[PDB]
Amino acid sequence: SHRKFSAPRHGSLGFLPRKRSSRHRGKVKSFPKDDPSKPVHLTAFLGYKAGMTHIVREVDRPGSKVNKKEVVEAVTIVETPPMVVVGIVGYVETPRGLRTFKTVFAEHISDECKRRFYKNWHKSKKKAFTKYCKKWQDEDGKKQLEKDFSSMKKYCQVIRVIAHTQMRLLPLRQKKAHLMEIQVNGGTVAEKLDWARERLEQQVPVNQVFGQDEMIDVIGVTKGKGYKGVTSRWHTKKLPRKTHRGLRKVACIGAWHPARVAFSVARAGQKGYHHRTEINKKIYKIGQGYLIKDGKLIKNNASTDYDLSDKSINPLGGFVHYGEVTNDFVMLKGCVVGTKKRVLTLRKSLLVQTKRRALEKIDLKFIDTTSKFGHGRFQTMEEKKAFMGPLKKDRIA
Amino acid sequence: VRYSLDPENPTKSCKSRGSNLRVHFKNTRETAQAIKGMHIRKATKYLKDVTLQKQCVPFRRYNGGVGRCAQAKQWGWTQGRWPKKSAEFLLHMLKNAESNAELKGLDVDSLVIEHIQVNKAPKMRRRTYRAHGRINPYMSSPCHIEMILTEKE
Amino acid sequence: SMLRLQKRLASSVLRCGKKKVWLDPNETNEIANANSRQQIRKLIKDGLIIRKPVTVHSRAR
Amino acid sequence: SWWPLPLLLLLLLLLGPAGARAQEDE
Amino acid sequence: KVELCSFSGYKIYPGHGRRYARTDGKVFQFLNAKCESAFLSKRNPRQINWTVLYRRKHKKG
RNA sequence: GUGAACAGCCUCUGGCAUGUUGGAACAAUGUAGGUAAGGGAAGUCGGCAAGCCGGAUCCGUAACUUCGGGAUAAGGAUUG
RNA sequence: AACGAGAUUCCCACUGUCCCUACCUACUAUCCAGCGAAACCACAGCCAAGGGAACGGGCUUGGCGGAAUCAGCGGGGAAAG
RNA sequence: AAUAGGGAACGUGAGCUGGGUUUAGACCGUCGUGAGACAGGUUAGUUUUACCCUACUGAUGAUGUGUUGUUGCCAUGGUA
Ligand SMILES: O=C(c1ccc(-n2nnc3cccnc32)cc1)N(c1ncccc1Cl)[C@@H]1CCCNC1
Ligand SMILES: [Mg+2]
Ligand SMILES: [Mg+2]
């Protein structure tokens, strides 16, 4: 009775069903609530984390001791090829919640959407949306497909956009696109719907959605750690060495008279692979990746104004366990939920903030692309064989 | 002798019986439920796959402790197991049944396993030696197997 | 084709251990036809049962 | 053959004493 | 600022390595624990082969 | 063979199939064995448990004493 | 004095005993083929309050109540011996 | 910042520890003629079982939608 020594609860009860999430792709539980006074835009975007590096920047912050000095920061980078818009969804508001009014898919649909609509693309006859594409072309279906837009415009009040990723531009194995469903927050619902009729089956890049030194959310599924015990899932204290039948256990799990174990106690089970939202991640740089062949392959990523060197942000030796980033990227200050190669959904924040850490301008000075596959100490292959010199590598001429 | 539920037409029927044979009762009961109503060329091809572990037996009644396999989803169940001894004995007299079928003049492209039951045989004992100077029994639990086959039309 | 007896009888007439005896595994049924020690001595002379010498234990180093 | 033979009487003898001792409060 | 390591003579980029200070006011730079340990193991760079001060004494590339 | 040695470790003569079963996997908790930055008993009824020290050679050894001891005191140096 | 697998207090040295845990290895546990017991058992098995042999699982009044199960777990069965 | 007070079978031993108490050995003091006594002191003293039912924790799945798939909504529960 009355522990003699106060101590707080281990772990949070706000994440209490520590369960394997029912989704691999992170689900936006809440898009930013809009007013129609803003211009028309997207709110969320799919991306794949490649790995981390660090950075050097001249941080401007009056008052602090950090002021006008170089300060390193951990940065993750997220490989984001452009999405491609396929569908328009309409949601009508009810006294029971939102309800999908109807959907309209694009006139002709890609290979990697259609692969997401199967559990065995090999055994399939590859037959999805084959009868649906023939109502865009017949005279009778075409007048009642554009009637489903005019009924969408009349009744439903929030509309969303079904877009998928281009997995062909990615070093992964998967080749199934991830099919997201993202809310447009424009002006009126007629302009909000005409902005998506304009731009079905077309690409939407990542710089069109997000901006530099702007602060977003990251939604994804965490690193899965498996079935772990009390002291690792819940960070409970170990018992002393002298304890019979075990160290890594919680000793008492309840009193007598509530004759029943509580949900509030800690006990062993699945650790990791949980659906989480990190808030207030600042974007450091929007990347542009491996452009036109007039100059044969301008790598040119991670080449700041203070660097002025032909570098590319993929490190020396490649990203470990990921591949090699040939596409656009968004780099974020700090750690981000997920394993490498995991789909994570970037999203503009709901809340507005000033805080003087948001809205500050960041100007880079240096990105290292040194080898993460060991204790690497060089940053380009030009830089190494200048220092290393000739070897027994060529040794024929 | 006399079996359970004699067939409605013993002209187009067949029968087989194995008595007092040392298999587990609980394993042999649940693969006999797996081939009840099954055609003889499919039941053989199923029973070969139980030994090769390409296709399992769903344990429905005697399921305590039985692990969850992926191959029991076909049967509409979660738990399954691959008894190769139990699927060998009722494959051995699945052959004896179709030995009697041509001996009576029946077509083995029409035989279904109509009736197959498994009931218990008298237990035979040996003993183990447990802590603090005690004796407890290892009792074997054999089974009696009888099957009735019938041409389908 | 149990050769356990002739393994034993050959280790007692070659004055050796059970390890040492018998190279050439091809004449299995001939040496299984033996059951006497005089049967097993005619196989010593015919080379089917050899002594297979001592494992080397050099005192060089 | 066939007809085997009988085994042996169990002949159990008691042992342990209320588990690991234990004395009530005085 | 991009410095040099005080044991092996390789080049340390900001973010990497570890800096060490001794009571007599000397401050040293190390880029990994392989260079950090051999300095603390009272050991001279000129004998070990990979370091830069070995490439300067012996006329290497 | 090594070594002060019927120690330990490794082999030859002679034995054996790993001790009443095999396969796949490498989660928790265990049992048994390690290792750990900075601090060094703050843990605990208690330094419990573990870790330090350890062989030999050269020095060098106090209080006390029944003059025998203590004493491999302690404390160093060395070793291919 | 010497000697104690005796009791105790301090100090040095040392260390995961602790801050504060982490990782690796073997043997399991786990899944499979075979073989396979025992303690225990009125009927059984979700709770809150009331009354009651004054601390219900069943009874009263409420809360509520879907098959079949697996790896764990030590609150309860005023658990077993 | 403050080092408030309590409860839950004086919460919590098939969760631990065993210091104390509280068997059997022994010593001392007082008591008794004596055997022995003393919440008087000291020292050394085996701490068993979950594989059952529920509860809790995770893991498949069940009902219903003709089958099956993708994208979703939020009743309710947790909540920092
Ligand atoms: O073996 C036993 C032992 C333990 C329990 C039972 N029990 N308990 N409940 C019982 C009901 C029926 C029968 N037997 C029963 C019997 C014996 N030991 C033991 N342990 C602790 C205290 C006393 C003893 Cl003697 C030894 C001692 C030496 C080290 N190894 C353990
Ligand atoms: Mg919401
Ligand atoms: Mg924490």
PDB file of C-alpha atoms (C1' of nucleotides) in Angstrom, chain D residues 20-21 23-26, chain H residues 21-23 46-48:
ATOM      1  CA  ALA D  20       8.760 -28.425   1.267  1.00  0.00           C
ATOM      2  CA  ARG D  21       8.005 -28.404   5.026  1.00  0.00           C
ATOM      3  CA  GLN D  23       5.682 -23.910   9.768  1.00  0.00           C
ATOM      4  CA  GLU D  24       2.784 -21.609  10.671  1.00  0.00           C
ATOM      5  CA  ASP D  25       3.069 -18.411  12.715  1.00  0.00           C
ATOM      6  CA  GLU D  26       3.461 -18.844  16.472  1.00  0.00           C
TER       7      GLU D  26
ATOM      8  C1'   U H  21      10.650 -13.845  13.330  1.00  0.00           C
ATOM      9  C1'   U H  22       9.520 -19.076  14.167  1.00  0.00           C
ATOM     10  C1'   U H  23      11.639 -26.161  14.735  1.00  0.00           C
ATOM     11  C1'   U H  46      16.143 -27.471   1.861  1.00  0.00           C
ATOM     12  C1'   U H  47      11.599 -21.488   0.315  1.00  0.00           C
ATOM     13  C1'   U H  48       8.025 -27.281  -4.175  1.00  0.00           C
TER      14        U H  48
END
